[PDB]
């Protein structure tokens, strides 16, 4: 009972599931394509807590995998390298055939730890995690993904750290060096943060010993 998209004589129209349309000429299977779209194009925030809060763990329900031939380039993508509080891997390893999406600009890894009760991390609004051209309903460990939907129609690594990943009370950091971190805030975009990381690193005004120095961005 899945609807398809079809092009009208003018603009785009909803193709029916039940009605036979006389103008809907289908001469080949090459006219039916699976296209992936990124939800960032619908205004979904790409901040770290904004995306992680949209994901969560649940038990019982099995994963599903779907196939694309084409899709949108993503500006912002994520991975996860999250372990349970005692190090016991929150996500299952991506199975054979699951690879990250073709291309993006800013890819985040959000490594870290947190409570992860459940069998899988599912998207809360039901968006798909887009891997390669094989999107799925769950997040797989170590493999990057885009956040998106399936239409059915006729760079750089940031590697933020995470604490308390699978719960509501969390912390996230941008790593400049092994001893140097910056606290994240949603008002600061990847461009800001990366310009900031180059300034800190290049100026050298950061920890240079063995101890951690963690910076907060001034309120202004």
């Amino acid at each position, epitope marked *: 009972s899945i609807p398809l998209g079809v092009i009208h004589n003018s603009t785009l129209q909803v193709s029916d599931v039940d009605k036979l349309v006389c103008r809907d000429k289908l001469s080949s299977t090459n006219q039916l394509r699976s296209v992936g779209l990124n939800l960032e194009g619908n205004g979904v925030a790409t901040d770290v807590p904004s995306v992680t809060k949209r994901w969560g763990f649940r038990s019982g329900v099995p994963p599903k995998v779907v196939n694309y031939e084409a899709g949108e380039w993503a500006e912002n993508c994520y991975n996860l390298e999250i372990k349970k509080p005692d190090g016991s891997e929150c996500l299952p390893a991506a199975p054979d055939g699951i690879r990250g999406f073709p291309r993006c600009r800013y890819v985040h890894k959000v490594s870290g730890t947190g409570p992860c009760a459940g069998d899988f991390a599912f998207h809360k609004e039901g968006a798909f995690f887009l891997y390669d051209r094989l999107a799925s309903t769950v997040i797989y460990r170590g493999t990057t993904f885009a956040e998106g939907v399936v239409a059915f129609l006729i760079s750089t690594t940031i590697r933020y750290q995470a604490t308390g990943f699978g719960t509501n009370e969390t912390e996230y950091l941008f790593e400049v060096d092994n*001893l140097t971190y910056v606290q994240l805030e949603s008002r600061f975009t990847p461009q800001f943060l990366l310009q900031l990381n180059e300034t800190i690193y290049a100026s050298g*005004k950061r920890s240079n*010993t063995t*101890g*951690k*120095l*963690i*910076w*907060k961005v*001034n309120p202004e």
Partner: antibody
């Protein structure tokens, strides 16, 4: 020698907060780390936190986390700190000290007079 | 984290006598991330030595020192009346730390 100028002593009641500041003059505000430190008589000196206007970042001593907020007014070349949740144990001289970040070194070469923060009831 | 203990925590010498002070640290500090200070009573401390060896501006040649590992040492060839100060050990390469301070008193 770049100077740091501070306000005089103030008495606070427990549970309140004090805002202190150091006016920087005779040199660059942006180029240096302005560090806040605390010294009560007989206790020695500890670091509270810092601001580096050039990076726009600040950092803190763990024992002063949340209670101490450090900022700066680039426009007035003034270093600011607010200490809150004050108790009688917080009585101390509060200082700014400017480091030698512009020289490639992080220790303190320039020091203020010290503002006394007194907390009592 | 770079915990320092100054020893002696106090010295007692007649002015004109030779004195030494050292600080132990719980972890190695590169000498380049360590400095010595002289604190006069009622005053902010004055930087004496940079990188645990280089005299700071305006510092007399009677002051000297060196360091490696966890061993930081300050000496004054002759302690003048003006030198009976509290000396401090500072770590500054990361979140900074200080030792408790050592007072050099007049005997």
């Amino acid at each position: 020698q770049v100077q740091l100028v501070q306000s005089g002593a103030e008495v606070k009641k427990p549970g309140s907060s004090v805002k202190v500041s150091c006016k920087a003059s005779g040199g660059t505000f942006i180029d240096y780390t302005y560090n806040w430190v605390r010294q009560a008589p007989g206790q020695g000196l500890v670091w509270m936190g810092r601001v580096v206007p050039g990076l726009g970042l600040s950092s803190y001593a763990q024992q002063f986390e949340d209670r101490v907020t450090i900022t700066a007014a680039k426009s007035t070349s003034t270093v600011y700190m607010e200490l809150r949740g004050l108790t009688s144990e917080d009585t101390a001289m509060y200082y700014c000290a400017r480091d030698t970040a512009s020289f490639g070194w992080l220790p303190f070469a320039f020091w203020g007079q010290g503002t006394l923060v007194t907390v009592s009831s | 984290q770079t915990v320092m203990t100054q020893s002696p925590g106090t010295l007692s010498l007649s002015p004109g006598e030779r004195a030494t002070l050292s600080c132990g640290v719980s972890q190695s500090i590169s000498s380049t991330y360590f400095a010595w200070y002289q604190q006069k009573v009622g005053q902010a401390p004055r930087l004496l030595i940079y990188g645990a060896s280089n005299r700071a501006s305006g510092i007399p040649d009677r002051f000297s020192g060196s360091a490696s590992g966890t061993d930081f040492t300050l000496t004054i060839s002759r302690v003048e009346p003006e030198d009976f100060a509290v000396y401090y050990c500072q770590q500054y390469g990361s979140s900074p730390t200080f030792g408790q301070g050592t007072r050099l008193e007049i005997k």
